Scaffold this active site. Structure first.
Site, PDB file in Angstrom:
ATOM      1  N   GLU A 145      22.532 132.731   3.476  1.00 37.27           N
ATOM      2  CA  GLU A 145      22.215 131.478   2.777  1.00 37.27           C
ATOM      3  C   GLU A 145      22.885 130.227   3.345  1.00 37.27           C
ATOM      4  O   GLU A 145      22.401 129.116   3.108  1.00 37.27           O
ATOM      5  CB  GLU A 145      22.526 131.595   1.276  1.00 37.27           C
ATOM      6  CG  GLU A 145      21.704 132.641   0.529  1.00 37.27           C
ATOM      7  CD  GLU A 145      20.207 132.327   0.437  1.00 37.27           C
ATOM      8  OE1 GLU A 145      19.771 131.202   0.794  1.00 37.27           O
ATOM      9  OE2 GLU A 145      19.469 133.213  -0.030  1.00 37.27           O
TER      10      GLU A 145
ATOM     11  N   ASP B 210      15.354 124.207   0.880  1.00 34.32           N
ATOM     12  CA  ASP B 210      15.430 125.581   1.390  1.00 34.32           C
ATOM     13  C   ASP B 210      14.226 125.927   2.285  1.00 34.32           C
ATOM     14  O   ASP B 210      13.427 125.049   2.621  1.00 34.32           O
ATOM     15  CB  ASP B 210      15.615 126.594   0.236  1.00 34.32           C
ATOM     16  CG  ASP B 210      14.349 126.815  -0.610  1.00 34.32           C
ATOM     17  OD1 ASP B 210      13.257 126.303  -0.285  1.00 34.32           O
ATOM     18  OD2 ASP B 210      14.454 127.536  -1.627  1.00 34.32           O
TER      19      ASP B 210
HETATM   20 CL    CL Z   1      19.663 128.570   2.319  1.00 30.36          CL
END
Ligand code: CL
Ligand code: R7A
Ligand code: CL
Ligand code: CL
Length: 164
Positions: A11, A20
Site C-alpha cells: 500500500e 489510489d
Molecule cells: Cl495505495
C-alpha cells in the site's frame, strides 16, 4: 515479515490525500476515504476519521493509527463472514495474512464472492487456487500486487516479499 509489513509494502505510505489505483481518494497506508469524486467529501471523511480539522495532511503516527484500525477491521470482517471464516480458520498463519491482504484491498463482500478460489484454498489445492485467483479483475488491474499475494497462497512462504 507479518501482515503489517506486508500491507505496508503493498500500500505504501503517503501523508497527503492521493488517488489510489482505482482513482479513489486515499491517505496513509492505503486508507480509502471515499469513492466520491469530490475532494471536499474526501477531506470531510479524513477529518472525521482523524478527529480534527486536517489540511488534507496527516502525520505518520496518524497514518499508522488508521492502518492499525484497518487491519483490525479486515480481520474482524473475515471472522464475521460465513464464507471467509471457515477458509481463514483452515489456513496457516502466512496464508491467513494473504487473505487479510485481499480483504484489506477489496473488502469483505468482494473477497467472499471468490467462491471457487475459496473452495480450492479450503481444499489446500494451492497451485489450482493460485491459477483460479489470477482469473479476476483483481489480478488484471493490479497484477504485481496480486502476483505477490497469490505466490503467498501458493507457497505458504514470504518469498514474494523478500528483498522488498
Ligand atoms: Cl495505495
Ligand atoms: S493457471 C494455468 C497456467 C499455468 Br499452471 C501456467 C503453466 C503458469 N500457465 O502458463 C497457464 C496460464 C496456462
Ligand atoms: Cl475510519
Ligand atoms: Cl500491482
Amino acid at each position: 515479515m507479518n501482515i503489517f509489513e506486508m500491507l505496508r509494502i503493498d500500500e505504501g505510505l503517503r501523508l497527503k490525500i492521493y488517488k489510489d489505483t482505482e482513482g479513489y481518494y486515499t491517505i496513509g497506508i492505503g486508507h480509502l476515504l471515499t469513492k466520491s469524486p469530490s475532494l471536499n467529501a474526501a477531506k470531510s471523511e479524513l477529518d472525521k476519521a482523524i478527529g480534527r480539522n486536517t489540511n488534507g495532511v496527516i502525520t505518520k503516527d496518524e497514518a499508522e493509527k488508521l492502518f492499525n484500525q484497518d487491519v483490525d477491521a479486515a480481520v474482524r470482517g473475515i471472522l464475521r463472514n460465513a464464507k471467509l471464516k471457515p477458509v481463514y480458520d483452515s489456513l496457516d498463519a502466512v496464508r491467513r495474512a494473504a487473505l487479510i491482504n485481499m480483504v484489506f484491498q477489496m473488502g469483505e463482500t468482494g473477497v467472499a464472492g471468490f467462491t471457487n478460489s475459496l473452495r480450492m484454498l479450503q481444499q489446500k489445492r494451492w497451485d489450482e487456487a493460485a491459477c483460479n485467483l489470477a482469473k479476476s479483475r483483481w489480478y488484471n488491474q493490479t497484477p504485481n500486487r496480486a502476483k505477490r499475494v497469490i505466490t503467498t497462497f501458493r507457497t505458504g512462504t514470504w518469498d514474494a516479499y523478500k528483498n522488498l
